[PDB]
Every structure is written in C-alpha cells, then in structure tokens.
C-alpha cells in the first residue's frame, strides 16, 4: 500500500465518502476522507492557480486556490509529517474523471524543498519549474492517461483530438527525482509547490478533480482509483 | 511611534516585563511582552542559527533556533499580519546589552519575501544573502553601535579592540531596500529569514539579546531602548 | 562624471555618433559609442524581452533581445569589468525620446547578482523581481519623467493621459539598494538581468531607445542627455 | 558511443595524450584531448572549489578552481553547445586513479540550469544542492567505485577503511533527473555548477583527476576508462 499525502481540488461532492455538499479544497492524509476541507467555487473554463506551503516548525500544511478575479479559498491543517511520510518521497500531480468529466490541464508547475540539518545548515535543496511541457518531457514520469506537449501543456486525463474530455479517466505526473522530505536529524524541513490549471466541462457536473501529492518513491496508480478516488487511494477508508 | 514585529532571542529574563524565568525565544507584536515564548538553552560562545518562517495562508509565524549539537527550540504564533504591519516595511537585526553584557555577532544573514497577487502571479520577490560583511557594506543601514567588517562579521553592539563586550550598548542593521510585505490584493504573501550568530560573555548573566524585526520603513532606534528593550520598543507596555 | 556601463536598445540610428544604419543592440562602456553592436529588427507595438548576462570567469558581457515570433538579436563583448566599474554600483533602466518619439514601457524587470569570495564561498547575493509596478513603488528610485503604476507598468518616459508619447523626454528607474558588483578578493562575480518592454510609435521613426545600465551609486541623469544620449552620458565622446 | 562534454581537473600530466607538462584545468569536448587548458597548482590535502558557467548568448564555457589561500586558475572556450550535446542530458561528477592515486572526495555539489523559450519566458529551470551525502542518497545515480555517506561526503573512487586511496579506480555520480539543456526554440539556455573537493595523496604524483561532465541521458562508464581517461572516454582520440 502506497503512503499518500495530498491536497485535493475536488470538483465533485461525493457525500458518500465524506465529501462536502459542494466543490472544495481539502487536505488528505492517508485517506480519501479529507482531514479538513473548505468551500471552493470552481470556475468552469477559467485558469486557476494553486499554492501549497508547509514547514516543519509551524508543522502546518496550508493551501490556497485563486482566480484572477480575486476569488480564492484556503485551507490549513496542523500536522507533523515526520510522523506520516517516509524520509524519501516523490511529488506529483494527479487527476481523474468519473461518470462525469472535465479536462484536467496543467499549464505550469514549480516546486521547492529544503532540509537544514543538525549540522547547522549544510542545507540540501531542490527546485524545479515547468512553464511549458514538450511532447517528450524526460524529467517527468507519466502514469495513466497523462500526456505532455499538447499546446505546451500537461493533460493529466484523456482528451480526444477535438478537445473533448473523456470519462472514467485517470492520470498522474511525478517529478523524476526523489525528494528528501525529512530527516530525524533535520532542524527544519520546508517546502512549497505551485501549479496553474484549467478545468473545463461541456456537460453537467464536472468531476472528479485534481490533486497535488507526495508519496513513497515507488508509488503507482492504485487499481480502480479513477473517478472519486482521484488516482490516489485504493479505497474510501 | 514605530510599528514593530519581531522574533527575540532573549538571553536575559526580565520577569518585571513578563519575561520567563529563563532565556527564551519569543514572538513580539508591537510589544516587548512576547505574545508567545519557549524555553531556550543558550550556549555561551557557541555559534547558533535562527530561522524564521511565515505565510499568509496558514497565517502562522514560526521560529527555530538550533546549535550543531542538536539542541533546538521552536515557537509559533497564529497571527494575521495584514492587520498589524504597514503594506511596506523594512527588515533588520537588532541587539543590545544591559547592566550585563555579551557580544552580539552576526556571521551571516539571508532573507526571502514573495507576493503573489490577485492578478494570478505576476509575482514580486526579494532575496538577499550576506555570508560576509565588509568594512563598508553599502546595502546595510547601520544604526547605533553596529559595525561591519570585523573578522568579516557584523557586530551589532559595541566591542572593544581586544574583543571585550561593552555594557549599555544597542545597535541595529537594516536592509537598504524597503520590502513590500503585503497587499490587500495579494493572494499569498510569504517570507523566511535566516541568520547565524555568536553570543559570548566573560562575566555572569549575559544580556540582553538579539532580535530579527520588521518595522515601518522609516523606523529608527527608540530612545532608551538599550538593555531589556532590545533596541526595538520605547517602553514595556 | 558618472561611470556608466550599459546595454542599449537603440531604436534610432544617429550615424553622427557612430550608430549603425539601422536600429540595433549595443554594448556601451563609458561611451555612447557602442564597443559592439548588432542589427535589431524592432517590432513597433509588440512586447519584447531582453536578457543580459555576465560572469567574471569568461569576462564576457552578453545580451539578447527576442520577440514571441522567434526574431532575436544577440551581442557579446569581451571585457573585464573589474577594470571599469567601481566596486559598488547601482543598476537601472533608462529611456529617452528625442525629435522623434515612442512609449518606453517596462512590463517587468528582474535581476540577480552573486559574489563568491577568496574565502571560498560565504557567498553574497541579491535578487529582485518586479512583474507589476504600483503607483508608489518604494524600492525604485525614479528619475526624470519615469512613472509607475499606469496599467501596473513602469513608464520610463512621458506619456499623456490618452497614451500618446511625448518628445524630448528622459527617464530612469534604479533599484533602491546598492549592489556589490566586484571585489578584488572575489573569485567569481556574476550577474544577469531580464526585462520585458513595449515600444510604440504613432509617427515616423521612433527614437531614441531604452538601456539597462550599471553606474556609480550616486549617479543621476546627466544634463541634456535626452534623445540620442539615452539619459546616460553627458556627451558623445 | 556516449557524447561527453566535461571540465577536467587533471592532476596528472599524460603528455602522450596532449596533456600539458603540469596539472591543469581543461575543457574537453567529445575528446580526452582538451580544447583548452590552463596551468593549475594543485594543493595536496587542501579543500578546493570549482565553479562552471555557460550561457547560450555568449556561447562561452568558463571554469575556475580556487583555494582559500587565494590561488585560482581559470579557463574559457568559445563553443556553441547547441551543436554538440543532445537536447536532453544528464550531469555528473567523475573521478579516477591510475598507476598513481589520490582520494577523490566531493564535499558538496550544486547545479542550476534554465531555458527561456521562443514563447518569451514560460521558463523551465532546475536547481539542486548537496552539502552532505548520506549513505543512501536516492537522488544520485552512483557508478563504479563511487560511494556516499562516509563522513557525509561523496567518495568518487575507492578508499579503504583506514582512508588510504586505491589505485586503478574509477567512479561517477550523476543527478537522478535528466536535464533539458537546449531547445531549438529556446532563446536562452544557461547553466552553472559548483562543487567542493578534497584531493589527497600519500605517495608521489597523484592521479588522475576529477571532472564535472554532461552526457547523453543513458551514459555509463566506458570500459577501461580508469586512470588518465577519467571515466569519461573510451579512448584518447
Ligand atoms: Ca471526489
Ligand atoms: Ca530582555
Ligand atoms: Ca540613438
Ligand atoms: Ca590525466
Ligand atoms: Mn473530497
Ligand atoms: Mn522577552
Ligand atoms: Mn548606439
Ligand atoms: Mn588533460
């Protein structure tokens, strides 16, 4: 079983799994049932931006999603990740469609992570930035229906030639290099991630959403994790 | 009256002002009376490192001080700085000595601040790093007894030719450029700061401490702010 | 007399001062007479981007200007800046108009500079980024006709209410903090700068151009340095 | 056959392969026979620092090696890498010993690479920094005799339990993620790399040296490339 920590933009309220009554941001720790959520007003066909922040001092995971018109939603959860994740992890983006559907299109993604040790600095750090994705992007590991290069963007879930989103689709993109997320001997571990995205739906009720996630290095898409499970978890426990 | 927000390494417990019974880290908002403190075991003559982190999402100010031997102390306080500081500020370091004394020596200082707007990025950012200070460091504004260039370090308070710390001393160093700390239209404002320091005392009970601070751009040392007031505040209110 | 090193985007050929027979990029060292130039096809009304790069190892100053359509021009010149500039400098943008005119609009500007010493690192560095300029941008020093905040941009030369460029105009913007550009004891000093710009003209030939420059810290606009002198030099020597 | 571009710190002059009559820095393009070299006074047992810089504008590859005592050597070579390397590459460190020997210890290594496209920015970038290496450093690919974790350092070539260097040894470390080094449509591609190293020898002349290199993504150590071939090239052509 993979170990997953994620921030979800959940466009589809499955109330059966503890989802709220409306599209939402949520913080998911080893469960599809968010530890915390906040109401999110999703704008169809508009380009949004998500920022994720964490530091080992405050031990608080925070996320915000905003649109150029000023609408934004934030969620924060107090958690000590030293106690959750493995020392080494990979980070990525995941997206799905269900019975209902949407394009899950990533326009850009950047990430920064830092470890300052008991050695008093001698800091290790990683930063990457993608503002365009080519057809062969060798520094990304693509899983599922994810493709790169279409209009210089990353399409996480299946889209036809004419731009129409497909249902029952799942895809993920992980950064090629492993990340050293924490160390018992680290005095501070902190990271932030940013991505811009475009969700569009022709039909009623888009679903199911997009998530930024951190997993064990060897993580792969759990079976039947399409739709409401967001390509992250094998079940709703 | 200046507006001050600071993180204090308070080596001297003035219990009269609400200081704890022991040297401590503290978070000070417009008052010398910390909103929150944590016990700190100060190691005389050892080089320490302080990290300060804040983000507008979690709205939590965090600080940690550590030594190479693994000892560290952390403190966090939930605060919305949009409601405290002016839109534009300056950042700096301050240090003092009282009746008792210590060297306040800064070995290195770095800082990073970012504003992502309602414009959806078009981000503004500032970063600077000093790992050595020359005799004339033009990008620093020195106030009080602060000097640069001695052994490539920044000495915040008065030290004689032979290295002996002087009492009743106060000094500050501010970065030359103003910083845009928040904007009503900003979706995220975040910053972090790091500095390494060396506190040494020949006599009993070093005092009074060192602080990292953010103030209105025109801030200058309040009169009689030496000793326990840390060159920050005009009084103990 | 100021000491000026600049990269010019010269939209107007003043053959009398050694300018080429067409708009051009040029490298100017202590003279309006470029040490090296390259032909530049300026696109009226289009948004361009300039990048400038230098390092103390190769001791080569390089610049490129490009447009989204793929047109670009580059120029490089071998030079040891240790022998030209003062140890401490300021960096800025300058623009002018003359008998002929153009808007000199800066959309964004970023800069990074680093000094790695004989101390083996203990590196000092500065980075800033502006992707929007507000009406009161405290970390910029504005000289001449330069204004900030109009459509979130920086307008270096005078523009009327209705958007019409004015003739015989000059303006500069300098970053507020001084920059430590070289040190006798530095093993490497390197910097890069980037800005995006929009030049528009209603009338016949636009003039006179925009430059990125580095000067002594107290540099101010030389008298009569409008038009072909680009606000940088007091004469054409 | 791999495609290799490297900067060599050649501690052993093999005059038979065009090496100079003294230890030297060199720039090697697809050949062990440096295109350019500079005399290098290697200090046995001292910690050195190497910096490497390149940009697509100046199209000049530069390198400097320095020690804390102020001794340094630099070498530069004009080259258009667009015409040499594949679009995607990996970067790494290599070292060898031969008949003669030395420790090839890396203390720290950082790297930054950036591509600004014809799209006008939408920049892609990668940065990493190692200031300590643990026993299991998952973001490094180790080849040959290379090991990590001994005193928090990276030992590229074989060293016994007691610290004694072994002869006829070769080892390399490559960053785990591929790097997009150029693109036909990029307006600027630039990178820099820095590492600190410790070379020690008990016996008479140390050999054979350490190199920073860029290769095709699937590059592996060519057979018999120990000693003077530095683990990079299959022959001396
Ligand atoms: Ca769902
Ligand atoms: Ca006190
Ligand atoms: Ca001109
Ligand atoms: Ca050799
Ligand atoms: Mn949910
Ligand atoms: Mn206190
Ligand atoms: Mn000219
Ligand atoms: Mn050689």
Residue numbers in the entry:
A (entry chain B), B (entry chain B), C (entry chain A), D (entry chain A): 1 to 237
Quote the study that presented this structure, word for word.
Other than in the carbohydrate-binding region, the complexes do not present any significant structural differences when compared to the unbound protein.
Lectins are carbohydrate binding proteins unrelated to immunoglobulins that display no enzymatic activity towards the recognized sugars. Lectins purified from seeds of the Diocleinae subtribe exhibit a high degree of sequence identity notwithstanding that they show very distinct biological activities. In the present study, we used mass spectrometry to determine the amino acid sequence of a lectin from Canavalia boliviana seeds and solved its crystal structure in complex with Xman and the dimannosides Man(α1-3)Man(α1-O)Me and Man(α1-4)Man(α1-O)Me. Furthermore, we characterized the anti-inflammatory properties of Cbol, adding more data to the repertoire of wide biological activities displayed by this group of lectins, despite their highly identical sequence.
